[PDB]
Paper text:
Cytochrome P450 enzymes (P450s) are a superfamily of monooxygenases that utilize a cysteine thiolate–ligated heme moiety to perform a wide range of demanding oxidative transformations. Within GPA biosynthesis, P450s function in a specific, stepwise manner to install the essential side-chain crosslinks in the core peptide in a process that typically requires one Oxy enzyme per crosslink to be installed. Given the apparent preference for the unusual heme orientation shown by OxyA enzymes, we investigated the OxyA homolog from kistamicin biosynthesis (OxyAkis), which is an atypical GPA. Structural and biochemical analysis of OxyAkis has shown that this P450 enzyme is highly prone to oxidation and can display an atypical heme orientation in different protein batches.
With the general fold essentially unchanged, we performed a detailed analysis of the active site of this P450, which revealed a mixed population of heme orientations as seen in the Fo–Fc difference map electron density at the substituent vinyl and methyl groups. However, even once the density of the methyl/vinyl groups was well-explained by a mixture of heme orientations; there was still evidence for additional density at the side of the heme immediately below the I-helix (β-position). To explore the possibility of radiation damage to the heme due to long data collection causing this modification, we collected several datasets using an attenuated beam. Even with a beam attenuation of 95% and collecting data in small wedges to reduce possible damage, this dataset still showed density in the difference map for modification at the β-position of the heme.
Author numbering: 5 to 66, 75 to 162, 181 to 384
The structure:
């Protein structure tokens, strides 16, 4: 439902979706059957206003333990507080060199296998999955099978008995009794499944985006210090996480000048908020600060953004440096993108040569 919020022209918005955004940053959508009233939050400020408000929950409208996205306060707060330290700046700094080496491992395989390569399946996917295992602290003997399968309750209970390194070891060590096997397995699942999906798509589609702007491909090679800026601009432009689960108002609340009634559901379009403003939409990695909501906002703000930002920075900076002659093996116009859907936005394959 609301398929219009996912209509794209390759990487850009479809004219049908652009026309919808012209109806204002907040659009009232009464269902034809009269069963409910829905809202589209299409603007940067409105999306942030909706997602920051405490007067919305994430009820199901007309469930896995450890899935933070399906919890509201106070239970959401309880679980997020236990896992949040795994993403501290000190955690990411200690992890960076090991992530760099994993990225280098996969670009080593790439340069040795020789061209061409299907970048999505053969590089981006394995890279994101391997970085995920390292962050989680998966034992090396389990990573091969854990990746192929994406068992979990079995893996979670065992690691919980003998806590090791990574996020799962930290949680089990500091909150052993407060988190169950199923909840710990759920934390690991979200990281290995949706998180990898979104990260691998940024790696692949982001590479294509850089290739379609060769002046910036080289610029990031000349000036690797733009990496952090480039990541923000890439996730903004891609918007692989296009739309969010509905937020239902728990009471009458005024948003963007209009009154959202209790019980009405609001659908935030990160795609539209990140891309609808033609002024300053061009892809430009020299932008020192991007206006985007690709990682969400509020209490549900992407808990893995620190890892995602670091992994993508390392991946893109090392890629342009080790493969300055990189190019699509087919005309970029022939790349296939997944048809509109609530699923993560991604291309179907990315054949590359160099
Ligand atoms: C390092 C890889 C990633 C990890 C570990 C990760 C972990 C999560 C977690 C734990 C949540 C739940 C937050 C909560 O409800 O409290 C989440 C939701 C989200 N993630 Fe991912 N994520 C990852 C890659 C991404 C990337 C690359 C993006 C950017 C497109 C992303 C955009 C989101 C957004 C926007 C939400 C919030 C959805 C909503 O508000 O309904 N994530 N992620």
């Amino acid at each position: 439902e609301h398929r219009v919020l996912h209509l794209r022209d390759r990487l850009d918005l479809a004219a049908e979706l652009k026309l919808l955004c012209e109806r204002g940053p907040l659009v009232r959508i009464p269902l034809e059957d009269g069963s409910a009233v829905h809202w589209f939050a299409l603007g940067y400020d409105v999306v942030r206003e909706v997602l920051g408000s405490e007067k919305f929950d994430k009820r199901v409208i007309g469930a896995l333990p450890g899935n933070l996205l399906q919890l509201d306060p106070p239970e959401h707060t309880r679980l997020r507080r236990m896992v949040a330290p795994a993403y501290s700046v000190r955690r990411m700094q200690a992890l960076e060199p090991r992530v760099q080496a994993i990225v280098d491992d996969h670009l080593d395989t790439m340069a040795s296998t020789g061209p061409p390569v299907e970048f999505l399946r053969e590089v981006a996917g394995p890279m994101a999955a391997r970085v995920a295992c390292e962050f989680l602290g998966i034992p090396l003997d389990d990573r091969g099978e854990l990746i192929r399968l994406t068992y979990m309750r079995e893996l979670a209970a065992r690691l919980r008995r003998d806590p090791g390194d990574g996020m799962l070891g930290m949680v089990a060590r500091d909150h052993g009794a407060d988190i169950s096997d199923e909840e710990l397995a759920g934390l690991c699942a979200v990281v290995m499944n949706s998180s990898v999906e979104q990260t691998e798509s940024c790696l692949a589609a982001g590479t294509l985006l850089l290739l379609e702007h060769p002046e910036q491909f080289a610029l990031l090679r000349e000036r690797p210090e733009l990496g952090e800026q480039a990541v923000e601009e890439i996730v903004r432009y891609l918007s692989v996480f296009e739309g969010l689960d509905p937020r239902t108002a728990t009471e009458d609340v005024e948003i963007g000048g209009q009154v959202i009634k209790k019980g009405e559901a609001v659908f935030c379009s990160l795609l539209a908020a990140n891309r609808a403003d033609p002024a300053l939409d061009g892809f430009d990695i020299t932008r020192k600060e991007s206006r985007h909501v690709a990682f969400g906002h509020g209490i549900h703000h992407c808990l893995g953004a620190p890892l995602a930002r670091m992994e993508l920075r390392i991946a893109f900076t090392t890629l342009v440096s080790r493969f300055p002659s990189l190019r699509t093996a087919v005309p970029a116009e022939e790349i296939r993108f997944r048809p509109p859907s609530s699923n993560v936005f991604t291309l179907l394959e990315l054949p590359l040569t160099w």
